[PDB]
Amino acid sequence: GVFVDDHLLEKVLELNAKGEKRLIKTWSRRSTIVPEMVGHTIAVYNGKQHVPVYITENMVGHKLGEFAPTRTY
């Protein structure tokens, strides 16, 4: 159903421990955001591209539709 790139978390927990607000790339398949991304631009792997989305404490929970919920087309 939905999976969160653990490979991105392994790098975001490091940014949450030092306090660095950088970006974390991902290349799995159903890459989704998490709570640890509330201050990072993680390039979630949409299946073909890495979209570095700076997640806040409200866009996480899906994958990127919460960061780009601007209707369709």
PDB file of C-alpha atoms in Angstrom:
ATOM      1  CA  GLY A   1       0.000   0.000   0.000  1.00  0.00           C
ATOM      2  CA  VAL A   2       2.241   2.859   1.226  1.00  0.00           C
ATOM      3  CA  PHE A   3       5.929   2.738   2.276  1.00  0.00           C
ATOM      4  CA  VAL A   4       8.283   5.406   3.689  1.00  0.00           C
ATOM      5  CA  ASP A   5      11.872   5.283   2.372  1.00  0.00           C
ATOM      6  CA  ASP A   6      13.769   4.138   5.483  1.00  0.00           C
ATOM      7  CA  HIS A   7      16.930   5.134   3.592  1.00  0.00           C
ATOM      8  CA  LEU A   8      15.757   8.777   3.817  1.00  0.00           C
ATOM      9  CA  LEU A   9      15.001   8.449   7.557  1.00  0.00           C
ATOM     10  CA  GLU A  10      18.526   7.088   8.200  1.00  0.00           C
ATOM     11  CA  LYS A  11      19.752  10.518   6.972  1.00  0.00           C
ATOM     12  CA  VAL A  12      16.946  12.709   8.412  1.00  0.00           C
ATOM     13  CA  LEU A  13      17.371  11.421  11.995  1.00  0.00           C
ATOM     14  CA  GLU A  14      20.956  12.641  11.629  1.00  0.00           C
ATOM     15  CA  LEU A  15      19.631  16.099  10.627  1.00  0.00           C
ATOM     16  CA  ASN A  16      17.180  16.033  13.574  1.00  0.00           C
ATOM     17  CA  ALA A  17      20.023  15.090  15.966  1.00  0.00           C
ATOM     18  CA  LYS A  18      22.438  17.841  14.853  1.00  0.00           C
ATOM     19  CA  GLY A  19      19.635  20.271  13.945  1.00  0.00           C
ATOM     20  CA  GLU A  20      20.757  20.559  10.286  1.00  0.00           C
ATOM     21  CA  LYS A  21      17.872  21.531   7.960  1.00  0.00           C
ATOM     22  CA  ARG A  22      19.134  20.119   4.630  1.00  0.00           C
ATOM     23  CA  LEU A  23      17.624  17.704   2.063  1.00  0.00           C
ATOM     24  CA  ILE A  24      17.464  13.866   1.982  1.00  0.00           C
ATOM     25  CA  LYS A  25      17.268  12.080  -1.409  1.00  0.00           C
ATOM     26  CA  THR A  26      15.258   8.845  -1.899  1.00  0.00           C
ATOM     27  CA  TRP A  27      15.072   6.176  -4.676  1.00  0.00           C
ATOM     28  CA  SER A  28      12.708   3.332  -3.622  1.00  0.00           C
ATOM     29  CA  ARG A  29       9.153   3.265  -5.123  1.00  0.00           C
ATOM     30  CA  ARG A  30       6.236   4.329  -2.856  1.00  0.00           C
ATOM     31  CA  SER A  31       8.498   6.806  -0.962  1.00  0.00           C
ATOM     32  CA  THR A  32       6.297   8.750   1.505  1.00  0.00           C
ATOM     33  CA  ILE A  33       7.026  11.551   4.031  1.00  0.00           C
ATOM     34  CA  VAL A  34       7.250  11.097   7.843  1.00  0.00           C
ATOM     35  CA  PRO A  35       7.177  13.207  11.005  1.00  0.00           C
ATOM     36  CA  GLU A  36      11.004  13.420  11.051  1.00  0.00           C
ATOM     37  CA  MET A  37      10.703  15.339   7.720  1.00  0.00           C
ATOM     38  CA  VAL A  38       8.860  18.330   9.337  1.00  0.00           C
ATOM     39  CA  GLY A  39      12.059  20.413   8.726  1.00  0.00           C
ATOM     40  CA  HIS A  40      13.818  18.841   5.686  1.00  0.00           C
ATOM     41  CA  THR A  41      13.542  18.869   1.869  1.00  0.00           C
ATOM     42  CA  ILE A  42      13.466  15.122   1.165  1.00  0.00           C
ATOM     43  CA  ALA A  43      13.482  14.226  -2.536  1.00  0.00           C
ATOM     44  CA  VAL A  44      10.861  11.472  -2.293  1.00  0.00           C
ATOM     45  CA  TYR A  45      11.281   8.981  -5.156  1.00  0.00           C
ATOM     46  CA  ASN A  46       7.989   9.294  -7.103  1.00  0.00           C
ATOM     47  CA  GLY A  47       9.072   6.119  -8.977  1.00  0.00           C
ATOM     48  CA  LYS A  48      11.224   7.987 -11.534  1.00  0.00           C
ATOM     49  CA  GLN A  49      12.271  11.349  -9.982  1.00  0.00           C
ATOM     50  CA  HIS A  50      13.457  12.591  -6.562  1.00  0.00           C
ATOM     51  CA  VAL A  51      11.247  15.557  -5.517  1.00  0.00           C
ATOM     52  CA  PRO A  52      13.046  17.376  -2.652  1.00  0.00           C
ATOM     53  CA  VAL A  53       9.939  18.486  -0.780  1.00  0.00           C
ATOM     54  CA  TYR A  54      10.505  20.541   2.375  1.00  0.00           C
ATOM     55  CA  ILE A  55       7.960  18.878   4.650  1.00  0.00           C
ATOM     56  CA  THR A  56       6.425  20.787   7.560  1.00  0.00           C
ATOM     57  CA  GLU A  57       4.322  19.368  10.430  1.00  0.00           C
ATOM     58  CA  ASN A  58       1.186  19.178   8.178  1.00  0.00           C
ATOM     59  CA  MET A  59       2.205  18.075   4.616  1.00  0.00           C
ATOM     60  CA  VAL A  60       3.580  14.678   5.778  1.00  0.00           C
ATOM     61  CA  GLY A  61       1.324  11.580   5.853  1.00  0.00           C
ATOM     62  CA  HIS A  62       0.941  10.945   2.096  1.00  0.00           C
ATOM     63  CA  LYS A  63       3.923  11.259  -0.320  1.00  0.00           C
ATOM     64  CA  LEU A  64       3.639  14.674  -2.052  1.00  0.00           C
ATOM     65  CA  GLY A  65      -0.141  15.287  -2.647  1.00  0.00           C
ATOM     66  CA  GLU A  66      -0.240  17.211   0.674  1.00  0.00           C
ATOM     67  CA  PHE A  67       2.524  19.522  -0.579  1.00  0.00           C
ATOM     68  CA  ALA A  68       0.908  19.957  -4.024  1.00  0.00           C
ATOM     69  CA  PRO A  69      -2.853  19.709  -3.369  1.00  0.00           C
ATOM     70  CA  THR A  70      -3.600  22.322  -6.072  1.00  0.00           C
ATOM     71  CA  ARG A  71      -6.586  20.543  -7.736  1.00  0.00           C
ATOM     72  CA  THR A  72      -5.931  18.281 -10.774  1.00  0.00           C
ATOM     73  CA  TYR A  73      -4.239  19.127 -14.130  1.00  0.00           C
TER      74      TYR A  73
END
